[PDB]
Write a protein that binds this ligand. Sequence first.
Ligand SMILES: Nc1ncnc2c1ncn2[C@@H]1O[C@@H]2COP(=O)(O)O[C@H]3[C@@H](O)[C@H](n4cnc5c(N)ncnc54)O[C@@H]3COP(=O)(O)O[C@H]2[C@H]1O
Lengths: 122, 123
Amino acid sequence: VTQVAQIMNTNPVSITADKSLQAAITVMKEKRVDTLLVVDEGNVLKGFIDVEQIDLNRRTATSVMDIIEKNVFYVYEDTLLRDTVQRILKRGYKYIPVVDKDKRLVGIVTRASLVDIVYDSI
Amino acid sequence: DVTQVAQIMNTNPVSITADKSLQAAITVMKEKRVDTLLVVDEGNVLKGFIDVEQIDLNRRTATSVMDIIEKNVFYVYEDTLLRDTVQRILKRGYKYIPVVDKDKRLVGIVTRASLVDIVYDSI
Ligand SMILES: Nc1ncnc2c1ncn2[C@@H]1O[C@@H]2COP(=O)(O)O[C@H]3[C@@H](O)[C@H](n4cnc5c(N)ncnc54)O[C@@H]3COP(=O)(O)O[C@H]2[C@H]1O
């Protein structure tokens, strides 16, 4: 039935991995998010960074790459919703980033995507 | 060391009261972009919380917010040391932590986006 592209939120907060921690937290505070999704010049999703990793490696870390986690679970645009929801609800994932066939960052399914979904079913 | 929660907590936590319907609740949740509502009475005293989850499960046989409230809330007072409440979210897996004044009145919560603030101050 329904795909993720339908309900996903089309404004996932990204930063490039050339940018400093000073700059990364700057965005994170403005945008009200505990992570950043890492993305290259052409917007191919590459990893994520944590607020914690910023805090553990702050003294000897100058940049976003210095602390990047490249093993992100993303899910393609046209995947079935049920699966990604099932992952977040039960398998503990905090949100699931959404890409296109070129692995370009295109959306996020946050817990407030579950609201959207539950709101619609009334 | 000696910094409190009140200093940092974000002072707009999303409440609802126990009369409101599920239709009413999920409305507030969507607007505000939040997976849970905190439950407060006429005089704003913290009582519990409801989820997207429970709203989703009990939809068919549940008209009111009270029908599915979770009365057992971890909460903390305004003047608790930040350090303890922060250490709870981080390594004890609490999703966020509601802060009350000494009359158990919701005055704030401490989100994962309260940590950024902390980490931002430290630089
Ligand atoms: N009664 C209430 N009053 C006030 N707030 C309430 C509340 N009940 C629940 N919440 C908050 O709702 C937020 C929504 O969770 P969600 O997974 O959509 O949203 C999460 C997370 O999925 C999202 N996020 C993280 N990295 C992101 C990125 N790179 N792009 C977009 N979103 C990101 O940022 C949000 C930050 O988590 P946080 O715990 O700060 O914020 C949570 C939680 O603290």
